Amino acid sequence: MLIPRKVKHRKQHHPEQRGIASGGTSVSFGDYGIQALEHAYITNRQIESARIAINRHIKRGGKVWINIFPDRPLTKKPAETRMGSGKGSPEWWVANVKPGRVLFELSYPDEKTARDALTRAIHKLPIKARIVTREE
Amino acid sequence: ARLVGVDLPRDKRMEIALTYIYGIGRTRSNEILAATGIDKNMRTKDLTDDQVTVLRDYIEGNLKVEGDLRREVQADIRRKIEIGCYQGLRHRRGLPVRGQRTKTNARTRKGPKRTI
Amino acid sequence: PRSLKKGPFVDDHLLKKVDVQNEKNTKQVIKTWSRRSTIIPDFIGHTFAVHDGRKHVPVFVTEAMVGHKLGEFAPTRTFKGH
Amino acid sequence: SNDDTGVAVPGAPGVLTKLAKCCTPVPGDTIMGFVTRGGGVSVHRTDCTNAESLQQQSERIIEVNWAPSPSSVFLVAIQVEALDRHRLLSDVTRVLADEKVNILSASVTTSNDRVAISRFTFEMGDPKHLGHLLSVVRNVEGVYDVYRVT
Amino acid sequence: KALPRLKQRYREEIREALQQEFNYANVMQIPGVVKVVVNMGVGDAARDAKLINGAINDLALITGQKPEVRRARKSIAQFKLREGMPIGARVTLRGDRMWEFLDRLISIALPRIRDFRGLSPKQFDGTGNYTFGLNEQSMFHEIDVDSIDRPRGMDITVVTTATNDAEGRALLRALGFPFKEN
Amino acid sequence: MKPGIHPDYHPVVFQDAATGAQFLTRSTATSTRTIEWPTPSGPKTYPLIVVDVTSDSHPFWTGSGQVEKFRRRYG
RNA sequence: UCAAAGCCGGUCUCAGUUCGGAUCGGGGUCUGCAACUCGACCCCGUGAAGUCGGAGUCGCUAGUAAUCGCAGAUCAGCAACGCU
């Protein structure tokens, strides 16, 4: 699971789920990629499960990139507690994923297995997504 | 350490004062002072300058002294022995090269003590 | 040691082994058992395998070791520590 | 030490030949020997890595031929994958059930290129018996990298 | 008039020799000795600042100037150092005192240090400004040797108008510095 | 540098003993700390201080195994 | 024609010293086929620790202890400062 070494502010406001992505809208790293079509907080678990799904659907051969790091904390109040008494402690680490943002990238020889691996990853992911290509 | 012909090596007789040099002992001092015309029963406070000059040039012409001699010693050890001769191995490991009991008393080379 | 009037001591075996190596200009290793035979300014390049107590011990002679007895290059005992 | 590896010296018998951990020169390839200053004859190969620094010491060397057939081998390893999720990491044991092996160059890393890199040791130092074990060890279906380690 | 020996020698022959060795388009591009600085960094004064006065006396009796006591810029836990304390005695030397001290140094002190196998010519900052160092003070005849209780070395730097180590080395060797050939 | 701050200087005479080399320079060794030995030099008179070795006298670079050993040993 | 300590004189003047002599570098001699491991001795140079020794402990009642040197055996040579 990805996680930052440190953050200047451990307790942060929720990232604004609005706007189309202005950066990371393209590939720039590989041949095939996952593009997002919804807003969502993508977490460590989601990222690692999708990476793993790719790395299992296809094995030694090709490369994978993760163009998002979940450096945005999300807190959780304890359970069975009242509202108030302060803000919760960080529990989840997410990355605010606006539409257009390319999340995962890979370079693999056969388009079939590459696209299928990316499909496995998307099914691990909480959002509607899309296969994209470096070419166009 | 500062001077070969230390103008005051130490205030005392010459035969014993010249031994305050890394290549001079009692007999070299005696033969030096005999080759020159300097008494040995005289202190260094009673020196002159010409005495020091004849001593310096005699020494620099005849025999070796602190820096050149010490470099000769260390170069002898390293180079002329080698990396891996016997006396060199034992110099390296800090032990008596010339044949000695290492079992009990080689402390002058081994150090004070490392009791386990 | 080894009074100059008596000259250096070199076992005749190693001598007849090395003089032919000189005069034929070949320098294959010499399997000489005796160590003790003072290195003389005749074979800087040739290699000897002197100590046969328990090991081969090759030794390539150089300029730097002439006169030294060949067994100095062939430690018999072994100590690594406790 | 002097029982199996070393009996090829032209000059005279008796050997203190040791096979330095440079290139595994035990296969019968173009090799030579450097009289290890304090430690015998380090036997090295022509395509060795630290061969130029030894040839810089050009006096302390001697001819060697080295075809002593009845002896042992230095050994060599290969790059082969694992998978790390409940299958195809125990394939290493499945394919080691048909071969015994000592550890040479193992390393586990999975936040990497697209595999749980598990570079695989081996006990195979034969010229004409390499592709055989490289087929026996190639069950994972994603066998792209197959070359040995030097 | 009464110029220093080294200085009249400089502007009589050394300038022309440097011109020949490096044909300078302009005379004002000729190398010249700007200053010499004698630092006597005594970091052992932090624990007790009584050694600084001996450093001061030594540098004064050597050069001819009261030194500047260099207060520490920074506090260092490892060196047992606070800010502001007397670590180092610096003397800047320009002009006639500079030339006189250089002549004294060259002609007296450097042959007076034990086992003087020369000074390194590589010891240039990269701008024709030399800097070497000493381990003691008795090499200067100006000090009474009996009054030397503690050895106290120094760092002597000779900064010039030269723009490279080559011209600096030429100038220094022309002045008569002992540059061993390496 | 100022008048009192600095030590005293005066042109003194560096005399070498090995060569008789003869320099004149201002030094902190002066009427305060010269060897009490004046001489005339030029149109004035200066005190001396003496030197054991100088740039002219000193043997430095301005003015200055073993098969051979074993062969003069063993012929 | 055997001593040494001793006696006389000179010098050193309380210091890690002209104490101490180890260790180490070089150059030698002698033995012996042969002194690397591994000899003794000599010369030049070096000049370590050691400032009278914690707990504790040993020998000795007179020609004794303490100190001084000498000889012998073994032995080519010596590691003998041991032993008699």
mmCIF file of all heavy atoms in Angstrom, chain B residues 1-4 6-8, chain E residues 40 58-59 62 108-114 134-154, chain F residues 14 50-53:
data_model
loop_
_atom_site.group_PDB
_atom_site.id
_atom_site.type_symbol
_atom_site.label_atom_id
_atom_site.label_comp_id
_atom_site.label_asym_id
_atom_site.label_seq_id
_atom_site.Cartn_x
_atom_site.Cartn_y
_atom_site.Cartn_z
ATOM 1 N N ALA B 1 62.726 17.700 16.076
ATOM 2 C CA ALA B 1 61.313 18.057 16.097
ATOM 3 C C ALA B 1 61.103 19.457 15.532
ATOM 4 O O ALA B 1 60.051 19.747 14.966
ATOM 5 C CB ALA B 1 60.760 17.963 17.514
ATOM 6 N N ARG B 2 62.093 20.328 15.722
ATOM 7 C CA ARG B 2 62.074 21.668 15.145
ATOM 8 C C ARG B 2 63.383 21.974 14.428
ATOM 9 O O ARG B 2 63.381 22.659 13.400
ATOM 10 C CB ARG B 2 61.791 22.722 16.221
ATOM 11 C CG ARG B 2 62.412 22.473 17.590
ATOM 12 C CD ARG B 2 61.936 23.504 18.589
ATOM 13 N NE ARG B 2 60.541 23.274 18.960
ATOM 14 C CZ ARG B 2 59.891 23.923 19.923
ATOM 15 N NH1 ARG B 2 60.494 24.860 20.645
ATOM 16 N NH2 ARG B 2 58.622 23.630 20.174
ATOM 17 N N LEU B 3 64.500 21.464 14.949
ATOM 18 C CA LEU B 3 65.824 21.775 14.433
ATOM 19 C C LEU B 3 66.680 20.520 14.482
ATOM 20 O O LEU B 3 66.566 19.710 15.404
ATOM 21 C CB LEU B 3 66.507 22.890 15.249
ATOM 22 C CG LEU B 3 66.153 24.373 15.092
ATOM 23 C CD1 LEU B 3 64.730 24.704 15.506
ATOM 24 C CD2 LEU B 3 67.110 25.188 15.935
ATOM 25 N N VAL B 4 67.529 20.352 13.467
ATOM 26 C CA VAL B 4 68.583 19.346 13.550
ATOM 27 C C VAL B 4 69.653 19.785 14.537
ATOM 28 O O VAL B 4 69.910 19.106 15.534
ATOM 29 C CB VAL B 4 69.181 19.018 12.161
ATOM 30 C CG1 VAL B 4 69.639 20.248 11.352
ATOM 31 C CG2 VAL B 4 70.352 18.070 12.320
ATOM 32 N N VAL B 6 69.566 21.817 17.008
ATOM 33 C CA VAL B 6 68.770 22.580 17.964
ATOM 34 C C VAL B 6 69.742 23.458 18.734
ATOM 35 O O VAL B 6 70.690 22.957 19.349
ATOM 36 C CB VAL B 6 67.953 21.651 18.893
ATOM 37 C CG1 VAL B 6 66.927 22.432 19.687
ATOM 38 C CG2 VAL B 6 67.195 20.551 18.143
ATOM 39 N N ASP B 7 69.581 24.776 18.614
ATOM 40 C CA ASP B 7 70.532 25.691 19.238
ATOM 41 C C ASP B 7 70.614 25.481 20.742
ATOM 42 O O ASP B 7 71.672 25.697 21.343
ATOM 43 C CB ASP B 7 70.158 27.134 18.927
ATOM 44 C CG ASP B 7 70.809 27.644 17.656
ATOM 45 O OD1 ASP B 7 72.055 27.697 17.606
ATOM 46 O OD2 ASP B 7 70.078 27.989 16.707
ATOM 47 N N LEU B 8 69.514 25.071 21.362
ATOM 48 C CA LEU B 8 69.506 24.538 22.723
ATOM 49 C C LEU B 8 68.761 23.211 22.650
ATOM 50 O O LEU B 8 67.544 23.167 22.884
ATOM 51 C CB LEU B 8 68.845 25.503 23.713
ATOM 52 C CG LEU B 8 68.560 24.997 25.139
ATOM 53 C CD1 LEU B 8 69.822 24.512 25.843
ATOM 54 C CD2 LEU B 8 67.871 26.066 25.971
ATOM 55 N N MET E 40 45.636 31.992 12.564
ATOM 56 C CA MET E 40 46.076 31.196 13.686
ATOM 57 C C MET E 40 44.824 30.715 14.396
ATOM 58 O O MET E 40 44.492 31.169 15.489
ATOM 59 C CB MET E 40 47.001 31.976 14.587
ATOM 60 C CG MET E 40 47.713 31.134 15.573
ATOM 61 S SD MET E 40 48.905 32.085 16.507
ATOM 62 C CE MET E 40 50.409 31.437 15.830
ATOM 63 N N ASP E 58 52.350 35.657 19.575
ATOM 64 C CA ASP E 58 53.167 35.012 18.558
ATOM 65 C C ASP E 58 53.001 35.696 17.212
ATOM 66 O O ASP E 58 53.988 36.053 16.558
ATOM 67 C CB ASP E 58 52.799 33.537 18.457
ATOM 68 C CG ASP E 58 53.430 32.703 19.554
ATOM 69 O OD1 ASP E 58 54.650 32.832 19.779
ATOM 70 O OD2 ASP E 58 52.702 31.922 20.201
ATOM 71 N N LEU E 59 51.757 35.891 16.782
ATOM 72 C CA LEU E 59 51.517 36.519 15.491
ATOM 73 C C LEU E 59 52.057 37.935 15.458
ATOM 74 O O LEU E 59 52.557 38.393 14.426
ATOM 75 C CB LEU E 59 50.030 36.533 15.178
ATOM 76 C CG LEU E 59 49.430 35.292 14.550
ATOM 77 C CD1 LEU E 59 47.966 35.475 14.476
ATOM 78 C CD2 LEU E 59 49.968 35.068 13.185
ATOM 79 N N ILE E 62 55.698 37.886 15.066
ATOM 80 C CA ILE E 62 56.057 37.387 13.747
ATOM 81 C C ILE E 62 55.889 38.476 12.701
ATOM 82 O O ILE E 62 56.848 38.889 12.042
ATOM 83 C CB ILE E 62 55.213 36.151 13.409
ATOM 84 C CG1 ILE E 62 55.659 34.963 14.248
ATOM 85 C CG2 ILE E 62 55.341 35.801 11.976
ATOM 86 C CD1 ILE E 62 54.595 33.936 14.438
ATOM 87 N N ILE E 108 64.405 32.763 5.825
ATOM 88 C CA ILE E 108 64.730 32.354 7.184
ATOM 89 C C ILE E 108 63.923 31.140 7.613
ATOM 90 O O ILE E 108 64.483 30.089 7.940
ATOM 91 C CB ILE E 108 64.489 33.512 8.168
ATOM 92 C CG1 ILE E 108 65.105 34.815 7.663
ATOM 93 C CG2 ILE E 108 65.014 33.176 9.535
ATOM 94 C CD1 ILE E 108 66.555 34.744 7.328
ATOM 95 N N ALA E 109 62.603 31.279 7.626
ATOM 96 C CA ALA E 109 61.774 30.381 8.412
ATOM 97 C C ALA E 109 61.595 29.035 7.732
ATOM 98 O O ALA E 109 61.730 27.988 8.373
ATOM 99 C CB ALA E 109 60.424 31.028 8.663
ATOM 100 N N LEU E 110 61.271 29.044 6.444
ATOM 101 C CA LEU E 110 61.073 27.791 5.727
ATOM 102 C C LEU E 110 62.295 26.884 5.744
ATOM 103 O O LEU E 110 62.114 25.664 5.892
ATOM 104 C CB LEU E 110 60.650 28.093 4.289
ATOM 105 C CG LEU E 110 59.413 28.958 4.103
ATOM 106 C CD1 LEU E 110 59.124 29.104 2.645
ATOM 107 C CD2 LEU E 110 58.232 28.358 4.773
ATOM 108 N N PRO E 111 63.529 27.369 5.590
ATOM 109 C CA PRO E 111 64.673 26.482 5.823
ATOM 110 C C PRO E 111 64.911 26.173 7.286
ATOM 111 O O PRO E 111 65.722 25.290 7.586
ATOM 112 C CB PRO E 111 65.845 27.257 5.220
ATOM 113 C CG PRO E 111 65.422 28.633 5.200
ATOM 114 C CD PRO E 111 63.960 28.640 4.991
ATOM 115 N N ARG E 112 64.228 26.852 8.198
ATOM 116 C CA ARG E 112 64.403 26.619 9.619
ATOM 117 C C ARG E 112 63.447 25.576 10.183
ATOM 118 O O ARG E 112 63.651 25.129 11.316
ATOM 119 C CB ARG E 112 64.242 27.928 10.384
ATOM 120 C CG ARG E 112 64.640 27.841 11.834
ATOM 121 C CD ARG E 112 65.054 29.172 12.389
ATOM 122 N NE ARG E 112 65.695 29.038 13.692
ATOM 123 C CZ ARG E 112 65.064 28.743 14.822
ATOM 124 N NH1 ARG E 112 63.757 28.532 14.842
ATOM 125 N NH2 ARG E 112 65.754 28.657 15.944
ATOM 126 N N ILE E 113 62.428 25.166 9.434
ATOM 127 C CA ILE E 113 61.545 24.104 9.907
ATOM 128 C C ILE E 113 62.183 22.751 9.651
ATOM 129 O O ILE E 113 62.890 22.541 8.658
ATOM 130 C CB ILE E 113 60.139 24.165 9.280
ATOM 131 C CG1 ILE E 113 60.157 24.432 7.784
ATOM 132 C CG2 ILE E 113 59.303 25.199 9.965
ATOM 133 C CD1 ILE E 113 58.820 24.263 7.154
ATOM 134 N N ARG E 114 61.918 21.831 10.571
ATOM 135 C CA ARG E 114 62.490 20.498 10.529
ATOM 136 C C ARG E 114 62.063 19.743 9.280
ATOM 137 O O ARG E 114 60.882 19.716 8.924
ATOM 138 C CB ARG E 114 62.084 19.737 11.794
ATOM 139 C CG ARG E 114 60.630 19.251 11.902
ATOM 140 C CD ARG E 114 59.651 20.382 12.126
ATOM 141 N NE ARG E 114 58.369 19.908 12.635
ATOM 142 C CZ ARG E 114 57.257 20.640 12.697
ATOM 143 N NH1 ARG E 114 57.237 21.896 12.268
ATOM 144 N NH2 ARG E 114 56.147 20.104 13.187
ATOM 145 N N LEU E 134 51.586 25.751 8.718
ATOM 146 C CA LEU E 134 52.669 25.371 9.597
ATOM 147 C C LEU E 134 52.092 24.773 10.863
ATOM 148 O O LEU E 134 50.948 25.046 11.231
ATOM 149 C CB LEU E 134 53.540 26.564 9.956
ATOM 150 C CG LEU E 134 54.000 27.436 8.801
ATOM 151 C CD1 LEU E 134 54.790 28.612 9.290
ATOM 152 C CD2 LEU E 134 54.820 26.628 7.870
ATOM 153 N N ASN E 135 52.925 23.991 11.542
ATOM 154 C CA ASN E 135 52.546 23.287 12.752
ATOM 155 C C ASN E 135 53.120 23.900 14.019
ATOM 156 O O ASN E 135 52.818 23.411 15.109
ATOM 157 C CB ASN E 135 52.996 21.835 12.654
ATOM 158 C CG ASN E 135 52.141 21.031 11.718
ATOM 159 O OD1 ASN E 135 51.139 20.442 12.115
ATOM 160 N ND2 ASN E 135 52.536 20.997 10.459
ATOM 161 N N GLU E 136 53.936 24.941 13.915
ATOM 162 C CA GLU E 136 54.571 25.512 15.092
ATOM 163 C C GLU E 136 54.957 26.954 14.783
ATOM 164 O O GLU E 136 54.512 27.529 13.785
ATOM 165 C CB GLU E 136 55.752 24.641 15.526
ATOM 166 C CG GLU E 136 56.863 24.450 14.498
ATOM 167 C CD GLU E 136 57.941 25.508 14.546
ATOM 168 O OE1 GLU E 136 57.998 26.276 15.522
ATOM 169 O OE2 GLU E 136 58.782 25.539 13.626
ATOM 170 N N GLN E 137 55.757 27.552 15.667
ATOM 171 C CA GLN E 137 56.125 28.957 15.573
ATOM 172 C C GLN E 137 57.606 29.226 15.744
ATOM 173 O O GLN E 137 58.063 30.304 15.349
ATOM 174 C CB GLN E 137 55.356 29.785 16.609
ATOM 175 C CG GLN E 137 55.530 29.369 18.055
ATOM 176 C CD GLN E 137 54.538 28.328 18.472
ATOM 177 O OE1 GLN E 137 54.039 27.572 17.646
ATOM 178 N NE2 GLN E 137 54.225 28.290 19.755
ATOM 179 N N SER E 138 58.373 28.294 16.306
ATOM 180 C CA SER E 138 59.800 28.482 16.516
ATOM 181 C C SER E 138 60.579 28.710 15.232
ATOM 182 O O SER E 138 61.715 29.188 15.302
ATOM 183 C CB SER E 138 60.377 27.273 17.236
ATOM 184 O OG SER E 138 60.019 26.076 16.582
ATOM 185 N N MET E 139 60.010 28.396 14.068
ATOM 186 C CA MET E 139 60.711 28.631 12.813
ATOM 187 C C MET E 139 60.995 30.106 12.579
ATOM 188 O O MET E 139 61.873 30.437 11.776
ATOM 189 C CB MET E 139 59.900 28.046 11.661
ATOM 190 C CG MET E 139 58.579 28.700 11.365
ATOM 191 S SD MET E 139 57.309 28.225 12.525
ATOM 192 C CE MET E 139 56.709 26.754 11.727
ATOM 193 N N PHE E 140 60.266 30.989 13.246
ATOM 194 C CA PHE E 140 60.499 32.419 13.171
ATOM 195 C C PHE E 140 61.479 32.825 14.261
ATOM 196 O O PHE E 140 61.196 32.653 15.451
ATOM 197 C CB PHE E 140 59.181 33.166 13.325
ATOM 198 C CG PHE E 140 58.198 32.882 12.239
ATOM 199 C CD1 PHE E 140 57.103 32.087 12.476
ATOM 200 C CD2 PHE E 140 58.365 33.412 10.984
ATOM 201 C CE1 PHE E 140 56.199 31.825 11.483
ATOM 202 C CE2 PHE E 140 57.459 33.149 9.989
ATOM 203 C CZ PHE E 140 56.376 32.355 10.242
ATOM 204 N N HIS E 141 62.622 33.376 13.855
ATOM 205 C CA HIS E 141 63.643 33.784 14.812
ATOM 206 C C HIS E 141 63.167 34.893 15.734
ATOM 207 O O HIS E 141 63.767 35.102 16.794
ATOM 208 C CB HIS E 141 64.893 34.255 14.079
ATOM 209 C CG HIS E 141 65.875 33.168 13.797
ATOM 210 N ND1 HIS E 141 66.898 32.847 14.661
ATOM 211 C CD2 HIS E 141 65.996 32.331 12.742
ATOM 212 C CE1 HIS E 141 67.606 31.856 14.150
ATOM 213 N NE2 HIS E 141 67.083 31.528 12.984
ATOM 214 N N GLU E 142 62.110 35.608 15.353
ATOM 215 C CA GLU E 142 61.645 36.741 16.139
ATOM 216 C C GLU E 142 61.166 36.313 17.516
ATOM 217 O O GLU E 142 61.166 37.122 18.450
ATOM 218 C CB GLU E 142 60.525 37.452 15.392
ATOM 219 C CG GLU E 142 60.962 38.111 14.107
ATOM 220 C CD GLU E 142 60.844 37.192 12.914
ATOM 221 O OE1 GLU E 142 61.198 36.003 13.046
ATOM 222 O OE2 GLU E 142 60.391 37.654 11.848
ATOM 223 N N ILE E 143 60.758 35.069 17.661
ATOM 224 C CA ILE E 143 60.302 34.545 18.939
ATOM 225 C C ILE E 143 61.492 33.997 19.705
ATOM 226 O O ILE E 143 62.353 33.308 19.144
ATOM 227 C CB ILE E 143 59.237 33.457 18.737
ATOM 228 C CG1 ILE E 143 57.958 34.061 18.182
ATOM 229 C CG2 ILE E 143 58.938 32.771 20.049
ATOM 230 C CD1 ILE E 143 57.068 33.076 17.508
ATOM 231 N N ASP E 144 61.535 34.300 20.997
ATOM 232 C CA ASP E 144 62.440 33.615 21.905
ATOM 233 C C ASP E 144 61.976 32.175 22.077
ATOM 234 O O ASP E 144 60.833 31.928 22.472
ATOM 235 C CB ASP E 144 62.480 34.333 23.248
ATOM 236 C CG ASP E 144 63.401 33.664 24.237
ATOM 237 O OD1 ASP E 144 64.624 33.633 23.990
ATOM 238 O OD2 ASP E 144 62.897 33.161 25.259
ATOM 239 N N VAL E 145 62.862 31.223 21.780
ATOM 240 C CA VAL E 145 62.460 29.824 21.771
ATOM 241 C C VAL E 145 62.156 29.327 23.175
ATOM 242 O O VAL E 145 61.307 28.447 23.356
ATOM 243 C CB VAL E 145 63.542 28.964 21.101
ATOM 244 C CG1 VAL E 145 63.103 27.512 21.085
ATOM 245 C CG2 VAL E 145 63.818 29.482 19.706
ATOM 246 N N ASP E 146 62.840 29.863 24.184
ATOM 247 C CA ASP E 146 62.578 29.449 25.555
ATOM 248 C C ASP E 146 61.164 29.802 25.988
ATOM 249 O O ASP E 146 60.595 29.129 26.854
ATOM 250 C CB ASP E 146 63.599 30.094 26.488
ATOM 251 C CG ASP E 146 63.294 29.845 27.954
ATOM 252 O OD1 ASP E 146 63.573 28.731 28.443
ATOM 253 O OD2 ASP E 146 62.775 30.767 28.617
ATOM 254 N N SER E 147 60.578 30.836 25.394
ATOM 255 C CA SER E 147 59.247 31.292 25.757
ATOM 256 C C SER E 147 58.142 30.574 24.998
ATOM 257 O O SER E 147 56.995 31.029 25.034
ATOM 258 C CB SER E 147 59.132 32.796 25.520
ATOM 259 O OG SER E 147 57.827 33.257 25.813
ATOM 260 N N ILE E 148 58.453 29.476 24.319
ATOM 261 C CA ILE E 148 57.468 28.711 23.565
ATOM 262 C C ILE E 148 57.061 27.539 24.447
ATOM 263 O O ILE E 148 57.757 26.524 24.515
ATOM 264 C CB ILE E 148 58.011 28.232 22.219
ATOM 265 C CG1 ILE E 148 58.369 29.414 21.324
ATOM 266 C CG2 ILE E 148 56.979 27.364 21.536
ATOM 267 C CD1 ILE E 148 59.254 29.041 20.168
ATOM 268 N N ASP E 149 55.924 27.681 25.119
ATOM 269 C CA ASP E 149 55.410 26.628 25.983
ATOM 270 C C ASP E 149 54.489 25.687 25.228
ATOM 271 O O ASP E 149 54.493 24.479 25.484
ATOM 272 C CB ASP E 149 54.661 27.233 27.170
ATOM 273 C CG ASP E 149 53.528 28.146 26.742
ATOM 274 O OD1 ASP E 149 53.445 28.452 25.533
ATOM 275 O OD2 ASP E 149 52.727 28.559 27.607
ATOM 276 N N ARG E 150 53.708 26.230 24.301
ATOM 277 C CA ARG E 150 52.735 25.495 23.529
ATOM 278 C C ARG E 150 53.025 25.690 22.047
ATOM 279 O O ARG E 150 53.152 26.841 21.605
ATOM 280 C CB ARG E 150 51.324 25.982 23.858
ATOM 281 C CG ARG E 150 50.201 25.225 23.179
ATOM 282 C CD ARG E 150 50.107 23.799 23.660
ATOM 283 N NE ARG E 150 48.829 23.189 23.298
ATOM 284 C CZ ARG E 150 47.669 23.447 23.896
ATOM 285 N NH1 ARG E 150 47.589 24.311 24.901
ATOM 286 N NH2 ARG E 150 46.573 22.834 23.483
ATOM 287 N N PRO E 151 53.152 24.630 21.246
ATOM 288 C CA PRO E 151 53.217 24.840 19.800
ATOM 289 C C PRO E 151 51.914 25.406 19.273
ATOM 290 O O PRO E 151 50.825 25.050 19.728
ATOM 291 C CB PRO E 151 53.488 23.439 19.246
ATOM 292 C CG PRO E 151 53.093 22.531 20.304
ATOM 293 C CD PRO E 151 53.433 23.222 21.564
ATOM 294 N N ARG E 152 52.041 26.299 18.303
ATOM 295 C CA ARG E 152 50.900 26.989 17.719
ATOM 296 C C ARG E 152 51.237 27.231 16.261
ATOM 297 O O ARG E 152 52.043 28.109 15.950
ATOM 298 C CB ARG E 152 50.612 28.304 18.428
ATOM 299 C CG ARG E 152 50.169 28.176 19.853
ATOM 300 C CD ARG E 152 49.901 29.533 20.445
ATOM 301 N NE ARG E 152 51.109 30.125 21.013
ATOM 302 C CZ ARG E 152 51.459 30.091 22.299
ATOM 303 N NH1 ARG E 152 50.711 29.487 23.212
ATOM 304 N NH2 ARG E 152 52.584 30.674 22.679
ATOM 305 N N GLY E 153 50.626 26.467 15.382
ATOM 306 C CA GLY E 153 50.878 26.609 13.970
ATOM 307 C C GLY E 153 50.064 27.731 13.381
ATOM 308 O O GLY E 153 49.622 28.649 14.072
ATOM 309 N N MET E 154 49.843 27.640 12.078
ATOM 310 C CA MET E 154 49.156 28.716 11.382
ATOM 311 C C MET E 154 48.830 28.286 9.965
ATOM 312 O O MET E 154 49.255 27.230 9.494
ATOM 313 C CB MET E 154 49.992 29.993 11.365
ATOM 314 C CG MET E 154 51.288 29.879 10.647
ATOM 315 S SD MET E 154 52.356 31.283 10.961
ATOM 316 C CE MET E 154 52.838 30.924 12.636
ATOM 317 N N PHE F 14 69.624 40.475 9.050
ATOM 318 C CA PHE F 14 69.653 39.026 9.110
ATOM 319 C C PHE F 14 71.017 38.552 8.638
ATOM 320 O O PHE F 14 71.398 38.785 7.483
ATOM 321 C CB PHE F 14 68.547 38.433 8.247
ATOM 322 C CG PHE F 14 67.251 38.273 8.958
ATOM 323 C CD1 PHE F 14 66.207 39.135 8.702
ATOM 324 C CD2 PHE F 14 67.077 37.274 9.892
ATOM 325 C CE1 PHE F 14 65.004 38.998 9.361
ATOM 326 C CE2 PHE F 14 65.875 37.121 10.544
ATOM 327 C CZ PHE F 14 64.835 37.984 10.281
ATOM 328 N N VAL F 50 70.785 36.527 14.032
ATOM 329 C CA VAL F 50 71.570 35.521 13.343
ATOM 330 C C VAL F 50 70.694 34.324 13.029
ATOM 331 O O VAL F 50 69.668 34.074 13.668
ATOM 332 C CB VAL F 50 72.806 35.097 14.153
ATOM 333 C CG1 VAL F 50 73.733 36.271 14.307
ATOM 334 C CG2 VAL F 50 72.412 34.534 15.516
ATOM 335 N N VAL F 51 71.124 33.573 12.025
ATOM 336 C CA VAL F 51 70.357 32.473 11.466
ATOM 337 C C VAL F 51 71.279 31.280 11.282
ATOM 338 O O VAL F 51 72.453 31.433 10.932
ATOM 339 C CB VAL F 51 69.703 32.887 10.133
ATOM 340 C CG1 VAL F 51 69.265 31.685 9.324
ATOM 341 C CG2 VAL F 51 68.519 33.764 10.414
ATOM 342 N N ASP F 52 70.734 30.088 11.509
ATOM 343 C CA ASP F 52 71.498 28.867 11.326
ATOM 344 C C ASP F 52 71.516 28.441 9.867
ATOM 345 O O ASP F 52 72.559 28.024 9.352
ATOM 346 C CB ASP F 52 70.911 27.753 12.190
ATOM 347 C CG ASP F 52 70.526 28.228 13.572
ATOM 348 O OD1 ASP F 52 71.328 28.955 14.192
ATOM 349 O OD2 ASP F 52 69.419 27.882 14.033
ATOM 350 N N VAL F 53 70.376 28.537 9.190
ATOM 351 C CA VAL F 53 70.226 28.073 7.819
ATOM 352 C C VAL F 53 69.320 29.036 7.069
ATOM 353 O O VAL F 53 68.312 29.501 7.608
ATOM 354 C CB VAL F 53 69.670 26.638 7.767
ATOM 355 C CG1 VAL F 53 70.676 25.674 8.343
ATOM 356 C CG2 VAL F 53 68.371 26.532 8.533
#
